[PDB]
Amino acid sequence: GEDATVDKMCLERFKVFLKQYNEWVEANKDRLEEDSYKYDQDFYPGRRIRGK
Amino acid sequence: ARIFHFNSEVLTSPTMESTLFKAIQWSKKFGGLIFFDLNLPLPLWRSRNETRKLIKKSWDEANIIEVSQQELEFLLDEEYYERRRNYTPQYFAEDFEQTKNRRDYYHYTPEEIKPLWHDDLKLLVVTDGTLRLHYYTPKFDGVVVGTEDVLITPFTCDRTGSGDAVVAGIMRKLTTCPEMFEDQDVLERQLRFAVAAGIISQWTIGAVRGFPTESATQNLKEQVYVPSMW
Asked: Which of B125, B138, B140, B142 is nearest to B194 (CA)?
């Protein structure tokens, strides 16, 4: 209940991972999509979701 | 004259180009239709941009235009359509017909053709030999399916002049069947006559020597096509 709200939990080590993960995502998102188009001609389940 | 016909070879001569536009002025004043049969000579294949500038004035004066598939793709974008033809799906075909690996008879959309369309243009015909005749009007568009058989006579076959027989067949039907411009079903039936003339023209060595008569063309059309398509 009120004792299990998120602010009550110790997730400090996972939050530092989230901060690093978000920085990596913003800096590599476009490059990863460009590589998907360069290497994979057609989409297929298991490939990177791209485009619209 | 009700149809004034000329090729782009006259654009390679400074004298003929000036004379050509006086002839067009006279023909239009008397109600004639202008037929531009492109037939690009060797110099005009060098670059798309130079050729488009060179033919633009004569293109805009024409009411009827005939181009080959190669000429049309060269005038718009040669590499885009070559890439389009060479595409193969990686995993599976998008439909059953794509599995048969058949020859490409791509029908250009009127939006792809839009850079070349103008107000006075009544009919654009794009010829893939005698195999396909893509036609475009302000109101509609479509394709006439044709055929060819030069392997029926391997030692007398000669394709030279078959493009002229197709154009002559179009002109023969346009003058006598003016509803071709406005009726799609009528246009397709009359264009099959032009297909037949092109086919016969490929069965003889020499263009002039092998040009077919009307009754021979009409006979071949009825032999090739089922009666409902006549």
From this structure: B125
Interface residue B91 vs chain A (CB under 8 A): yes
Which residues in chain A touch residue B89, judged by CB atoms under 8 angstroms apart?
42
Q: In 3-state terms, what secondary structure has residue B143?
A: strand
CA–CA distance from B65 to each of A16, A35, B171, B220 (Å)? Answer: 68, 44, 11, 26
Structure tokens at B39: 């037939």
Task: Give the torsion sign (CA, B209, B213, B219, B224).
Answer: positive
- Do B223 and B229 touch, CB atoms closer than 8 A? no
- Resolution in angstrom units: 2.5
- Nearest chain A Cα distance for residue B220, angstroms: 45
DSSP conformation class of B57: H
- Chain B residues touching A41 at Cβ < 8 A: 90
CA B46 to chain centre: 21
A40 → chain B, closest CA residue:
B90
Q: What is the dihedral of CA B117, B68, B81, B188, to 10 degrees?
A: 70
Is residue B72 within 8 A of residue B126, CB to CB? The reply is yes
The DSSP code for A8 is G
For B220, the enclosing helix (H) or strand (E) is helix B214-224
Contact B195, B188 (CB under 8 A): no
User: Cα distance from B52 to chain A (closest Cα, Å)?
Assistant: 33
Which residue is listed with tokens 């509609």?
Answer: B140
The residue to which tokens 């003929």 are assigned: B16
Instruction: Give the C-alpha separation, B172 to B189, whole Å.
Output: 13
